[PDB]
Amino acid sequence: ELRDQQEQVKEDMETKCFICGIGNDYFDTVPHGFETHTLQEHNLANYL
Amino acid sequence: ELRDQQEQVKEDMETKCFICGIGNDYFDTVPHGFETHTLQEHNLANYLFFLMYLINKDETEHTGQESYVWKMYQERCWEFFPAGDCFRKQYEDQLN
Amino acid sequence: VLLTNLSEHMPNDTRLQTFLELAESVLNYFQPFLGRIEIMGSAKRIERVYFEISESSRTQWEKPQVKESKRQFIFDVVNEGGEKEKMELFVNFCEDTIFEMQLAAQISESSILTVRSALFALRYNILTLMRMLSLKSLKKQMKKVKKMTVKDMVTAFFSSYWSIFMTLLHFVASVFRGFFRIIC
Amino acid sequence: FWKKIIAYQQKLLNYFARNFYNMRMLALFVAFAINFILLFYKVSTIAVHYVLEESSGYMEPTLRILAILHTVISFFCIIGYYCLKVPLVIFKREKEVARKLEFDGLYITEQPSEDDIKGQWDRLVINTQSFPNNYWDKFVKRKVMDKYGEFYGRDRISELLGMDKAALDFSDAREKKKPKKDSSLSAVLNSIDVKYQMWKLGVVFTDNSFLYLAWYMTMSVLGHYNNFFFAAHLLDIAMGFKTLRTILSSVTHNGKQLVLTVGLLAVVVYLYTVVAFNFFRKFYNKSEDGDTPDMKCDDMLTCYMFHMYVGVRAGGGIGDEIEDPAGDEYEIYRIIFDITFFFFVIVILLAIIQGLIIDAFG
Amino acid sequence: TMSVLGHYNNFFFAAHLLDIAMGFKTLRTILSSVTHNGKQLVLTVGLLAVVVYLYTVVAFNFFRKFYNKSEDGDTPDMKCDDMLTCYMFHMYVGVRAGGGIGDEIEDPAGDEYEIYRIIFDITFFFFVIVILLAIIQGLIIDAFG
Numbered sequence: 001e002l003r004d005q006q007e008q009v010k011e012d013m014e015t016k017c018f019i020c021g022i023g024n025d026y027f028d029t030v031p032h033g034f035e036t037h038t039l040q041e042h043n044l045a046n047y048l
Numbered sequence: 049e050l051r052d053q054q055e056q057v058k059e060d061m062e063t064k065c066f067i068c069g070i071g072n073d074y075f076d077t078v079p080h081g082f083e084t085h086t087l088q089e090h091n092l093a094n095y096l097f098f099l100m101y102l103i104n105k106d107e108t109e110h111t112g113q114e115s116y117v118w119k120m121y122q123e124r125c126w127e128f129f130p131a132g133d134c135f136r137k138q139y140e141d142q143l144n
Numbered sequence: 145v146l147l148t149n150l151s152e153h154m155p156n157d158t159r160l161q162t163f164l165e166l167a168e169s170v171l172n173y174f175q176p177f178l179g180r181i182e183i184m185g186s187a188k189r190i191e192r193v194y195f196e197i198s199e200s201s202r203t204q205w206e207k208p209q210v211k212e213s214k215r216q217f218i219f220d221v222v223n224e225g226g227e228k229e230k231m232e233l234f235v236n237f238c239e240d241t242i243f244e245m246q247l248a249a250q251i252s253e254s255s256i257l258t259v260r261s262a263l264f265a266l267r268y269n270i271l272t273l274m275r276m277l278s279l280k281s282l283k284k285q286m287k288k289v290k291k292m293t294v295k296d297m298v299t300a301f302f303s304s305y306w307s308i309f310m311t312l313l314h315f316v317a318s319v320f321r322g323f324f325r326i327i328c
Numbered sequence: 329f330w331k332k333i334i335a336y337q338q339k340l341l342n343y344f345a346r347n348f349y350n351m352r353m354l355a356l357f358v359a360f361a362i363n364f365i366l367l368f369y370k371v372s373t374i375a376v377h378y379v380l381e382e383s384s385g386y387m388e389p390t391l392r393i394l395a396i397l398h399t400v401i402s403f404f405c406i407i408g409y410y411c412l413k414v415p416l417v418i419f420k421r422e423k424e425v426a427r428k429l430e431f432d433g434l435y436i437t438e439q440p441s442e443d444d445i446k447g448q449w450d451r452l453v454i455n456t457q458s459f460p461n462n463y464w465d466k467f468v469k470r471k472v473m474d475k476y477g478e479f480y481g482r483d484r485i486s487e488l489l490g491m492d493k494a495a496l497d498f499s500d501a502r503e504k505k506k507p508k509k510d511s512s513l514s515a516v517l518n519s520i521d522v523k524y525q526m527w528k529l530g531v532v533f534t535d536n537s538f539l540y541l542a543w544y545m546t547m548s549v550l551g552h553y554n555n556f557f558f559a560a561h562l563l564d565i566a567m568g569f570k571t572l573r574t575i576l577s578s579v580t581h582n583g584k585q586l587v588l589t590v591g592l593l594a595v596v597v598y599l600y601t602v603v604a605f606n607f608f609r610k611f612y613n614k615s616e617d618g619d620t621p622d623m624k625c626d627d628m629l630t631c632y633m634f635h636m637y638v639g640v641r642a643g644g645g646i647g648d649e650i651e652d653p654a655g656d657e658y659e660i661y662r663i664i665f666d667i668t669f670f671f672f673v674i675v676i677l678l679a680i681i682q683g684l685i686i687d688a689f690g
Numbered sequence: 691t692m693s694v695l696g697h698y699n700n701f702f703f704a705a706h707l708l709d710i711a712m713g714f715k716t717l718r719t720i721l722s723s724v725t726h727n728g729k730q731l732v733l734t735v736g737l738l739a740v741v742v743y744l745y746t747v748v749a750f751n752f753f754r755k756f757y758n759k760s761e762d763g764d765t766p767d768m769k770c771d772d773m774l775t776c777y778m779f780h781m782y783v784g785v786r787a788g789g790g791i792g793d794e795i796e797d798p799a800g801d802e803y804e805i806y807r808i809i810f811d812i813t814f815f816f817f818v819i820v821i822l823l824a825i826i827q828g829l830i831i832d833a834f835g
């Protein structure tokens with residue numbers, strides 16, 4: 001159960017934006033689009 | 049955990065292209081489309097063979113496309129690898 | 145390569161399609177040696193590149209050691225890696241594999257008895273089983289079956305399968321005998 | 329006569345094919361009854377004989393009747409298998425060989441590997457006149473003829489497939505023949521295709537289920553000479569019952585890994601035995617008589633037997649069955665030896681088996 | 691009915707502690723692991739019984755001198771002179787033993803059937819104590835999962 005919980009956290013953070021909740025499929029129409037969105041546009045550290 | 053890791057590798061390789069990352073659902077609008085794409089269009093063995101060909105070919109003998117790829121490789125810039133795009137998606141209007 | 149480029153960039157041209165069938169043998173000969181990848185060209189468009197794959201390169205790629213290396217690499221990139229280093233790791237693996245296959249190419253320059261015994265046992269035992277019929281002495285059993293009876297018919301019905309079972313037992317014994325003679 | 333016998337033969341074949349499974353399941357019940365009766369089988373005192381204890385006295389005639397019934401049912405089960413499941417096997421084999429001839433050229437362009445029993449035995453059925461006897465496609469010979477006739481030689485292909493050469497031409501043209509009747513034994517002999525039946529018998533004898541049923545018959549026969557051979561028929565629960573297969577698949581799913589784990593355990597215990605034989609020998613005396621020792625590690629083989637048997641079956645390891653190491657020069661060494669044996673063999677190596685079974689379940 | 695019987699015998703109120711499974715709902719999660727694969731747990735016990743019966747048949751036919759369970763030299767306690775008695779012995783003592791049937795019978799060293807007895811004991815320990823008792827653990831853990 002602990003392994004599955006950690007894997008679920010990793011999968012959610014890798015396939016869904018924390019703030020807006022849009023999946024990585026939409027953002028990955030531009031190369032590295034999800035990474036750009038989650039590190040420059042909707043960065044939770046930036047919100048803090 | 050080892051069983052799950054192997055199953056995850058198998059699932060990823062069967063449902064997502066290694067190079068472009070487009071899922072098999074898009075490619076399977078033509079019969080055997082995913083297999084055709086992953087064995088003829090975006091074959092990682094083909095990319096390795098291309099790297100071998102480019103390395104073994106003389107620098108002055110490259111075509112323009114080969115020289116472009118060679119310069120990107122020498123700069124270690126991997127923007128020439130298709131990411132989220134392919135021939136079918138680019139020319140979907142013309143091809144079909 | 146020219147014909148493949150034209151066909152793949154003109155997918156619905158009937159004249160080119162009828163022209164290609166005049167080059168099937170050449171295209172089939174050069175099919176394993178025709179490389180084909182896709183790149184994001186300098187014109188900001190996906191472009192398809194055609195190159196040459198050598199027979200030596202393909203043979204060294206299809207070696208079991210290289211296959212194991214590729215399997216391990218794919219496992220590692222799927223599990224312990226991300227997309228943000230995927231193409232760097234792939235290029236590193238390609239370089240290592242290319243060096244390994246070049247080295248392999250340059251360093252590499254230019255039971256049945258049990259199966260036969262089992263087949264012989266099958267032949268011998270089945271021929272012995274069929275010799276009751278190949279003996280041509282069915283007159284005796286015909287004279288026995290002249291007084292046709294349900295009991296006689298059922299007895300013959302059971303006896304045929306009993307003979308089959310005995311033939312199988314003899315075949316198994318012959319197999320054991322052949323194995324024991326071969327090992328000793 | 330010659331038609332009535334065939335009609336009755338077909339009736340019997342149909343009955344046995346229909347009731348193959350019923351008698352297959354009845355044999356298991358009879359085996360269970362025999363083995364339950366066998367639980368009252370004592371030994372009474374040299375030439376010692378086994379006696380069937382019985383207060384009623386009805387036990388022995390019932391046992392004899394049940395053994396005879398079991399043998400009869402086993403024979404009937406083989407007959408039913410031959411009537412029911414053999415045709416499917418023959419159909420599948422014929423289809424496979426026909427499609428390998430047509431779409432692979434298995435005997436025209438290539439040849440079998442000379443160590444494949446199926447490929448080498450299939451050579452016989454190609455020439456037979458009764459080919460696809462069970463397979464629907466009756467035109468496989470003509471199809472291979474058309475495909476490979478030109479380049480590989482029409483006469484060569486015809487000889488390979490055992491087809492007619494020139495009688496068909498004259499028969500499409502003009503020829504005359506004389507009739508026959510089924511009553512002629514010579515006519516029946518000509519009708520029977522010896523080579524095709526030879527190949528069929530070979531395939532059936534190579535079948536893995538027919539061999540199992542023959543073994544069942546063999547032990548049912550041996551049970552009459554010794555009544556305790558009917559106990560081997562209780563191994564049939566795995567095959568007869570399908571719910572037990574789910575339980576047994578957990579063992580057999582990781583079957584190769586379970587064997588390799590035992591091999592690894594054997595190697596580890598061999599290493600421990602080497603260490604003991606070289607350093608810890610005085611601790612392996614297994615006798616209470618002071619005069620005569622029972623030295624169990626004075627030989628490499630004996631020490632290995634001891635470690636694999638007693639040490640492995642012990643719940644604490646090899647240290648539970650040897651001399652106490654306290655007050656000795658090699659005391660800490662013996663403690664490490666015993667603790668590592670317990671951890672690696674009793675705890676870890678025996679945990680891999682549990683993990684393999686549970687992982688098979690999952 | 692058991693509450694009434696408890697007045698005649700006060701120890702029938704102990705059967706009312708079986709009501710914890712029904713009254714408590716958190717205990718149901720624990721008890722479902724046993725009852726989820728309930729039929730398979732019974733079939734595993736049946737398979738164990740069959741395997742031990744086969745081992746008992748082998749012992750009764752070949753290994754009988756090893757089943758003396760008495761220290762008095764004059765009078766033996768032969769526990770495999772009867773099929774039923776040997777089966778009771780194997781199912782009870784051999785199964786409950788932590789090393790198998792070889793932990794509770796005569797030592798086989800210095801005998802004609804020594805390697806045969808060693809194989810008998812080792813296979814019993816592996817198949818019954820180790821494997822057949824592991825299927826129960828696996829069934830419970832798989833029910834949890």
Ligand SMILES: Nc1ncnc2c1ncn2[C@@H]1O[C@H](COP(=O)(O)OP(=O)(O)OP(=O)(O)O)[C@@H](O)[C@H]1O
Pocket residue numbers: 013014016017018019035038039042043044045
């Ligand atoms: N709103 C978001 N803000 C930040 N990361 C996000 C967001 N939505 C999704 N992500 C993804 O979640 C991932 C988790 O990042 P995380 O902060 O756990 O690790 P990191 O930045 O790689 O480094 P580390 O944990 O070592 O400090 C990010 O790399 C990003 O791809």
Ligand SMILES: Nc1ncnc2c1ncn2[C@@H]1O[C@H](COP(=O)(O)OP(=O)(O)OP(=O)(O)O)[C@@H](O)[C@H]1O
Pocket residue numbers: 061062064065066067083086087090091092093211
């Ligand atoms: N870029 C890609 N290149 C190759 N295969 C890909 C790619 N993307 C997805 N795949 C899929 O991953 C699968 C894994 O192929 P892999 O190389 O592991 O095995 P294989 O070709 O069937 O043979 P083997 O492993 O026995 O040599 C391919 O069959 C293909 O469907």
Ligand SMILES: [Zn+2]
Pocket residue numbers: 017018019020021022037042
């Ligand atoms: Zn967002």
Ligand SMILES: [Zn+2]
Pocket residue numbers: 065066067068069070085090134
């Ligand atoms: Zn792709």
